[PDB]
Amino acid sequence: KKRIVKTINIDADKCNGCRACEVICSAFHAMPPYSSNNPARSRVRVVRDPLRDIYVPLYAGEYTESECIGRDKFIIDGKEYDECGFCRASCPSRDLFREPDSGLPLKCDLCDGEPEPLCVKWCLVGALSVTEREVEEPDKRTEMEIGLESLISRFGADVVADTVEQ
Amino acid sequence: KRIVKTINIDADKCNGCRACEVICSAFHAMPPYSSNNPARSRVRVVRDPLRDIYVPLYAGEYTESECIGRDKFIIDGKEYDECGFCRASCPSRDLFREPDSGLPLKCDLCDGEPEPLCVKWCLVGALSVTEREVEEPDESVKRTEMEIGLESLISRFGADVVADTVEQLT
Amino acid sequence: MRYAETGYVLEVDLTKGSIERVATDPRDTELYLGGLGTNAKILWDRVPPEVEPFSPENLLIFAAGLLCGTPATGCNRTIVSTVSPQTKLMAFSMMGGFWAPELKYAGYDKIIFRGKSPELVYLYINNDKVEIRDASHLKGKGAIETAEIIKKELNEPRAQVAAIGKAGENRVFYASIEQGRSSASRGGIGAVMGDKGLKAVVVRGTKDLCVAKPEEYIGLCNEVLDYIKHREENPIPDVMPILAGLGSPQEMKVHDEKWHTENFNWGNARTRRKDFWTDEVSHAWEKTMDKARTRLISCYNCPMKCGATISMEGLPTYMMKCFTKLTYTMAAYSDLDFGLRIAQKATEYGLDGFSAPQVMAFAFELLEKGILKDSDFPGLPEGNEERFFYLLDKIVNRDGIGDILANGTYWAAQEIGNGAEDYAHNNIKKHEQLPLKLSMLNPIYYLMYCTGEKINITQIEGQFPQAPYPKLEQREAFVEDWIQVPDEKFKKIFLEWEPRGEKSMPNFPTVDMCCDIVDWQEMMHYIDDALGQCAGLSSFPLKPPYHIHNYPKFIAAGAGIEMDTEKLKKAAKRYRTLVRAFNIRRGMRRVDEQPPANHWKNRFPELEKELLDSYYKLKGWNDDGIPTKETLDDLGLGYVGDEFIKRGILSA
Amino acid sequence: MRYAETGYVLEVDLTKGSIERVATDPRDTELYLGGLGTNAKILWDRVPPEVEPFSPENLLIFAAGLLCGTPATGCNRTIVSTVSPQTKLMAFSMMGGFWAPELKYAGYDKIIFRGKSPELVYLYINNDKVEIRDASHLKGKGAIETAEIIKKELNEPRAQVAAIGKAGENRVFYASIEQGRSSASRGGIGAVMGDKGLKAVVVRGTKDLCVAKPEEYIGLCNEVLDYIKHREENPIPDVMPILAGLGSPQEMKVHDEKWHTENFNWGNARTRRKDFWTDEVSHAWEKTMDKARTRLISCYNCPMKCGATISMEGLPTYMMKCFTKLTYTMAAYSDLDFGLRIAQKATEYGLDGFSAPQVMAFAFELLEKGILKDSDFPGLPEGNEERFFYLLDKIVNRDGIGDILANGTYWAAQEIGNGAEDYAHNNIKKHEQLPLKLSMLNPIYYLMYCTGEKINITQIEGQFPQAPYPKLEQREAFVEDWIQVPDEKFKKIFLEWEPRGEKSMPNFPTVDMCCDIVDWQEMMHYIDDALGQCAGLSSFPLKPPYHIHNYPKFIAAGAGIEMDTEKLKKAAKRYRTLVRAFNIRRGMRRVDEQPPANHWKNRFPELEKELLDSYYKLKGWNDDGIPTKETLDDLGLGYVGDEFIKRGILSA
Ligand SMILES: Nc1nc2c(c(=O)[nH]1)N[C@H]1C(S)=C(SSC3=C(S)[C@@H](COP(=O)(O)O)O[C@H]4Nc5nc(N)[nH]c(=O)c5N[C@@H]34)[C@@H](COP(=O)(O)O)O[C@H]1N2
Ligand SMILES: Nc1nc2c(c(=O)[nH]1)N[C@H]1C(S)=C(S)[C@@H](COP(=O)(O)O)O[C@H]1N2
Ligand SMILES: Nc1nc2c(c(=O)[nH]1)N[C@H]1C(S)=C(S)[C@@H](COP(=O)(O)O)O[C@H]1N2
Ligand code: SF4
Ligand code: SF4
Ligand code: SF4
Ligand code: SF4
Ligand code: SF4
Ligand code: SF4
Ligand code: SF4
Ligand code: SF4
Ligand SMILES: [Mg+2]
Ligand SMILES: [Mg+2]
Ligand SMILES: [W+6]
Ligand SMILES: [W+6]
Ligand SMILES: [Zn+2]
Ligand SMILES: [Zn+2]
């Protein structure tokens, strides 16, 4: 009936760009633990342009197999952010959240099994925290049929049929 | 040497009218322009006039799973929403998903048309699209919209259940 | 299949808590289009003259225009209809923003409220799901404050909310209904809403809204957008900025306030300050405005961004547009800073920004003269600005003298006596007018003040130029591409019209010319208020993108019904006389159709009589302002004529 | 397997364009740790005394500290070593920020540059990929400007760049090397870089960096972070703010500039303004700083955020930390606004913020006295502020008088003559000092000024309090938890030390106490400059989280080599005397080890002689400042001793 979601609250305005989070996450997520570190292996990566006053901790999100048809570039409150500036994706267009050697995706698991997120523990200025709440667990098979009719109207009754055979 | 396209969003210029939501959804109706519905637009404006937040957000790529932790940003004195910048077509919210079926939406820059319609209708000129060439190889697994759609349903309802329904509809 | 309209309304009985969806009659759409038109039909045969404004049988109707929710640029207006507690006549009130389209996306054309709720409640609509919620925890909250609280409770960030403030709850006769950057402001529709125990109406919609002819409809929209571009590159030549472009009066943008502050009347529509706009004042206001204006923002699907978010130091943000910017300032003989600060309070309370400042300036004139004593104002501060804040709170609480002043200048004077009636010098049909007292009689505006059922001059003017050009070359250039005119004769009138000499006002344009001009202007407004189209892109500005020639195309391609220029003109006339008929049945006669005595300094009784006489004839009404049997039958309003004869309003 | 260090260096011959990776000797790590230590070893046996600073045989070494790239908080310093063009002695220069760790992640401990490039070039490192790129399009660009241009060309947004400005390119003797919020500032290492035709060094790294004992190393780091927290909640009691906490001098944060502006000497280290810090000045500077300070930002892996981005109106943003904020202002007798504006120009040019303002103030004194004429300054503006901007441009271009002034006060005076040497009154070993002229002789600081191989007082002080507490209770409380002391005797000294009376300076602490104190302070700095640890968390502030007791634990767990307190003390001594040995071989003697004549107003020749005499003995050097054969053999520096005997520097 009810499941928990966890939100990482990032106060980019407090960030000083020290990149310590990057250090400790790679070091922990290393094998064996702490035997090495490597910011390129961090599941948190800071978007850092000091000249633009931009300091934005980004967390590893989901894996996507293809780039977007269009990439997005924001201008917000005067600041000109980078292309795909706020994307969490492990995406073929960049090296963020992907192994620097192999290229395998990386995901944040909130340090599953530790008493505390290490990125949060090492951010002494306190720009990072995690909070939890109870939501309504997912609940629905008329949705399926409505979507299959949508696909038929767009691509053809015979196209959807001979695609399902795959 | 391929071509990548950028969508330039000047959210300082946005007035929050949602003309972009109207025209996109209109054009994507079947048949085109036969109706409109902001809830199925492939561009969706984050809008909160009291907090002066106006961010246009373009649908991106499909994810079948949610992230283990969601993110919420305070940037330059503004408190944005949980996942408030994420382009993902994601099972955690209704953005970029059909409101009756849950099917993934995806922006294709009005492929085949003269120009993107959201850009055409944004009269104050908050939106634009530019292109550039890159040496980097394109490593995308190019999948058809019908195939992403069908697989999202097969992932939700099961291969056999979807196959059988398709038989009883064709 | 129904098109553009959804074909359904919500019937809500607040006394019983019952909610019903009812299908509408497609014939009513063919006769009265929608919006205001179909509202008038509902009120006519469901609200008899014996019904009081604050009785359960009075209706409060929320309507979306026929073409709201379609891609039509700027088509987003809600039309609120009821019987006014101030004028005792019909009151329709327009509200822009985002509320009407959401209702269409929810699947409804109207919401009709009857009865009274014993407890404070609000209505929650989410597609097919409708329910009445308790709102006791919202008692006294501002109209904007209320919306934010509600959306958090319901966890619906994209819901649209229309609410009343404390003023509505206390049945202030000029209480409004507020929604973000939008307001149903005039007539006291907020008072009826509060009287029914209704705190807010919350709506979320995610259904599709269809049009009949897809390719043709989107083509007309593109045509409009192209005209809007051309128009912004080519403003009306040699005319002061606020008249040169599209949109509502662009008061939130630039322009020097020289004409406005030197022609409007300060205080209780009293003082004219000829040389007020000095260099010191101009920079002071410019500085205040640059600091307070956060962003220029638009209503749904419109690029004109007439509104502006306002942020004064230490105050919650609110939204302002048009003449609200000047009224509080001018009524109190103060500066722009004060005006912006008090209008924040007034918006949250939910008060009409036309009536409220005149009421307060009215009260202080009585205190000045001696008709009111200091005994009537216990705890009255000494500073001028502070006094207005003081009185404002007394009014919205109906506390002491506030209880009387909450009734408006007309009823307040009548209750106060001692010659207080002389100071309510700016009413028409008991409704406060725009604070403008000109010198020479304007025959065109004389007619509009007298007969306009909105009883507000800025919501009946527009299509014809307010003033003539000096040089003939300027007129020839203007009429050249004036495609919006119904007849080529309107061009020839404007060519002849001159600022001075034999071809000037009040003798020119002639009586017949003035009747044709007012008729055209009024018609475009009634079409807008049926279709839901913002007047900012239609009836209000010179050379709009929407006009009598392309409007029928929109209706036909949008709603899928037969429509041409002539059938549209007749439709507009049909429910405009129906609204007239409603007010007749509530006691309105030719006697009530007079402007304030001091409205002009140069009056002409014989000319004014011939004007009104000729206008009535053109409208098809008799000499007492009543639609004749003949013209009623011709419009398909035969049932109206029969009731007039049966009620003895017309002779058999 | 090598740990903490990568075990490799890059050998680059700019004359031939050759690039080679070479494995290092693990024995050198055991003897000289890393960073400055291993730099000294390289310079000793590869740069003989006959090598000139601007000759191809001179080396420019970029080194990362031993523990850079590990999780150790604040461990990120680059150490740049070469032979100074100003002092003709060794010059090591420290640079924080993000550059040294990136080099480690790229897989290298050092880069050694030899030879000269005929064309302007830059070096690009990306993991195993190294190449020399043309940089002719970058000629004259500022050091920050250069970094941004390069990173766009290479499409490497996360690359770290160290560059010179125009000053470096023109071999200005006090030209620096800049990297974002970091600077290798003093000694003229920027001049050597430009002389070799090297415009920038660009590095990108994505390899893993390993430590020997994982669980134990991360435990020590946690211990440090916990101490940093405790320390920020418990600053040093009863001491002025800028001395009470960790980090570099926190000039970018708050604090009243009363002590600084009333004790430092304005102009050419000349004027002392006793009552300068008025209420008017305090608010004026506060206002300028609140407006200009954009954000407080940190070096790699540090929470102390000592630096600040500075944004003056109409100027590109730059980064400032520490005393740079005061030097330009004070040298020109101006305000903070001017200082922040000119320091922007000076950072892009790449000039040392200690020497450059003193050189300019020096020049204007000569113009004042008459030693220089107006003929020497063609086009000299009349305004004071404008004159400094004028002269700054002449210097970085080596234009006219700028060509002489670009050599620094010492060499400029020597070339100018006419008694200009009298005005170069603030040099030690031809190197401009911090503008501070005190009254009473400080025995502890006397020793440091005389013998410090950095020839900069702020980079040898730290661990012992600068001033004593008045009340004894304050001293008892301080020493209570003073765990950082090598011996319990340092507590007892500070207990006895008093501001006035028999137990005050210069007679107390005694000669032997002063020698032990300076030795401890100096030792901590040399350990920091080998390990790459920022002095802001170690040698510089009172009661730091890194100290002589836990440092060996870090080395052992990080690098995987045997290390204890005694072996670490000896290691520090080993390469500190090696650096001493290098300067001896280049002609330094006891005669050069004197402070400026006017450095104190109260001098004591017999006391000063005994101080230096006792310090030399403690160091193990003879009376001429030369390490003896015996102490060299004991340190494992036998090869040093042999060369001294062969060169006749020591008697057999
Ligand atoms: N189809 C159509 N569209 C529009 C109008 C029309 O008559 N027919 N009117 C215009 C104008 S000119 C405006 S600007 S502001 C304003 C007005 S108007 C009157 C209120 O009249 P009402 O019928 O209720 O709209 O008086 C003022 N009182 C006021 N009171 C409060 N509490 N807040 C306010 O902002 C005002 N503003 C004054 C706009 C107004 O749009 P809204 O979204 O605020 O309703 O509507 C145009 N469209
Ligand atoms: N290891 C080491 N760290 C050091 C120093 C030093 O001399 N050695 N100098 C300190 C001082 S006084 C300052 S202002 C900063 C300057 O940092 P930067 O070299 O990156 O500009 O480094 C601090 N950290
Ligand atoms: N251009 C420039 N010069 C500078 C500085 C600086 O940050 N930028 N730091 C000053 C301070 S406070 C110190 S401690 C030294 C550091 O010297 P180093 O970088 O040569 O080790 O340089 C001084 N000169
Ligand atoms: S550790 Fe904290 S301040 Fe440092 S970069 Fe990460 S989130 Fe920002
Ligand atoms: S990085 Fe993210 S936003 Fe950019 S193309 Fe890839 S998935 Fe889309
Ligand atoms: S929460 Fe854990 S997994 Fe996620 S970035 Fe931080 S340390 Fe890594
Ligand atoms: S059309 Fe442009 S201005 Fe309007 S909401 Fe869309 S992006 Fe913003
Ligand atoms: S909406 Fe995006 S950011 Fe949020 S959980 Fe889904 S994939 Fe992650
Ligand atoms: S470019 Fe086309 S598909 Fe993409 S959001 Fe805009 S209108 Fe929709
Ligand atoms: S023109 Fe102005 S008032 Fe009219 S709908 Fe657009 S924003 Fe609203
Ligand atoms: S203490 Fe200051 S100078 Fe040292 S590493 Fe940290 S932020 Fe940089
Ligand atoms: Mg309105
Ligand atoms: Mg430095
Ligand atoms: W208005
Ligand atoms: W310093
Ligand atoms: Zn105005
Ligand atoms: Zn200071």
PDB file of C-alpha atoms and ligand atoms in Angstrom, chain D residues 251 255 257 260 325-326, ligand 17:
ATOM      1  CA  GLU D 251      41.157  37.585   4.557  1.00  0.00           C
ATOM      2  CA  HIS D 255      37.080  40.423  10.425  1.00  0.00           C
ATOM      3  CA  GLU D 257      40.968  45.177   9.172  1.00  0.00           C
ATOM      4  CA  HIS D 260      46.344  44.813   9.402  1.00  0.00           C
ATOM      5  CA  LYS D 325      43.738  41.836  -0.970  1.00  0.00           C
ATOM      6  CA  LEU D 326      45.824  44.432   0.906  1.00  0.00           C
TER       7      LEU D 326
HETATM    8 ZN    ZN E  17      42.674  41.744   7.061  1.00  0.00          ZN
END
